[PDB]
Symmetry: C2
Subunit: 415 residues, 2 copies
Amino acid sequence: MLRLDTRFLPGFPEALSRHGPLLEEARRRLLAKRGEPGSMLGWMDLPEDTETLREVRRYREANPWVEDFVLIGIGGSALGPKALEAAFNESGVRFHYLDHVEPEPILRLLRTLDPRKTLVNAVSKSGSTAETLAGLAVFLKWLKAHLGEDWRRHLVVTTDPKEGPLRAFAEREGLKAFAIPKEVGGRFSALSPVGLLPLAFAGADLDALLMGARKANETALAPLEESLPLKTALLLHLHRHLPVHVFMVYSERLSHLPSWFVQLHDESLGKVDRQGQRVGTTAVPALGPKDQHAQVQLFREGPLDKLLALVIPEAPLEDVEIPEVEGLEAASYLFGKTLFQLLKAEAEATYEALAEAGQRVYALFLPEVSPYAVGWLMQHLMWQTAFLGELWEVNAFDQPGVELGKVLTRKRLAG
Amino acid sequence: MLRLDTRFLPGFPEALSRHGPLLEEARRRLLAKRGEPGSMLGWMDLPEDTETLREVRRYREANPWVEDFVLIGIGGSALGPKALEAAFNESGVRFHYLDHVEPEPILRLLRTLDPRKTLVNAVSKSGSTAETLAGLAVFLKWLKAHLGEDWRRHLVVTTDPKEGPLRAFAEREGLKAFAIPKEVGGRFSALSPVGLLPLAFAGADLDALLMGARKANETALAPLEESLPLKTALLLHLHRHLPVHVFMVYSERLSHLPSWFVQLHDESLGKVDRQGQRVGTTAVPALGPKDQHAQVQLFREGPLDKLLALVIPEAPLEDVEIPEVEGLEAASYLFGKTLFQLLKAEAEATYEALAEAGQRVYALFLPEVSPYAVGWLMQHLMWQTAFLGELWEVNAFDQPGVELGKVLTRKRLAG
């Protein structure tokens, strides 16, 4: 059960009632856009597509030879997969993310990977993302050079079902391809094959992941008092006057989740509203307890300009008891305790410390770090973001600001 | 040679001139503090220690059996090492960082690493950091159980030369130990054995790293016009009221540098000044070009409340030509160009786009990503930060805010 804790924000229950109408209206506006072509709300439906999932799995089982999975993708095509694979890799398959174009790290891959054991997954919604095309071209030459005509079995594409150069290339070469639904933006595509394909090779429980996401869907359409997504949307809305929103996760397995959320929040809400005003808060990634040794100092004695969300697990999947050390008595207070016990204590300690310093902070508790709880959390955050899009009167599903950089890049490349 | 570019900040030359006296005094105040025990300015001298790096090299050479290096450390004892090792690993030795206490990831390491090929490095300045003592306890049991009498050779300690439980433990057990100078704080310890030891096993050029840092020391003492650290200190100072400071690096090899800077900036300047006021800006990490697909959208159309610094390399160490692909004509504009050429184009393009959007942005150019250039950059930033400590009238070398969390943690664990 994903649980919202606002022990340090006493006025919330009342503020929720007060803003009930506003929230109901924001939700009404969003839902009224479904089915409308181009509204980009397809991410709502991904958790219900259990058939594509079985298809992804079948393909994975038909290719047990894969030892190295090279995902050539950037942004929405990489952050979700990275976040999920780092947390649920049970298969031992090695994942390499080409979410950049710096030559050296890529040459190292070409020189250390066995072509016969490598599967390249080119991922891009439009299929024309510059970085991905560049990386693909490099890996294609490599594949053909080492595998001859047997290269095609080593390249799988994930892109729009009909449009774009990747789709066309896949059709032309008879390559296996998965689809990113037309109405699903890259930023909201984590639960589509974008995330499902690599997770299948990672041997994660895809069914549990989607089960969690479907539960989040239920909370999104539930009565206000049970609509967690609307509650957290309100929390951010009520603190929209604070420029920074910190997303801190107390888990190493979920070390890549903060980055995924930063993109979700930043790219969705950093927009010009209906009123022509530049809006959006700055999402800042953090991990616990490591960031108690990097950013907490600032949260504690720096400006009171932040709204902090802490994601805390309540149980481990497999704990470890901290053993006694002869000759190291200074650590005796730890002996007998478990690592998760230390993890949880630090999370609770920091949560309190942040509140004691006057910062506005709340927590989202996860029963444990599992596909079910994480799928719930991610889908929840996508809903949160979508609702905020209504409350802030912006288009939460586009990204007008990234176009110029692409044009200027082409210019400098050509002349 | 590091290069500062302020092409999109036309009023900077006048501002530098006008604030000349202020900057000169900030520098004088900092330098006047040297010599005085407890000033925590030992990081200025690390580049001139031409004895310790030899000792580090000899130790490494005497242990060519290491295939896996497990660094148990957090915050200042982990970020510097991660940033450096990720950028300069030439040996292929696999590094594992215990900068957390979540049970599963650690259990995975205990079950997949070969004890005979593993070297454990416990790093902590105080020697009593909770997370590190817990991680060490666990690995100690593991080492003893699988290595017998030869366990001691697989554990090396990096801590204060005289204080703390780690120092005492190392002397009691006859373990190899390296020293973090008394006057060197954790977040300023990257060029001490904290970073030198792991870098040695990574096969990187330690000498070049310190030489580059020495160059930065020179710039810190140079005439104002040539003192890059005082110039960037001014830039951050002139935007001290803006809540956010983005640090974006256009390199994958340096993917861990932003995190290192965030701790350096946040923990040092997020303080209560001498007038009792809360000060400090929020450092936000970013990587190029991947963040053009995640955070740039917000920088482009969101609030103009940031000062952005872009770190851009000017040359690759080894480039890669993007090969033409038969059947992928939509990518022909990339054929013939190189990966670095693309990287550079995107960096310049984004730098300009950010300025076009009205954001206060500047760039720091590195000749290439090398120990020399990066050592220069890191030392430059430490000076920048120390100068800012004077300009903002705060103690940039302590961290009062993290104590409560530790106290509450012990309280929780006890009961």
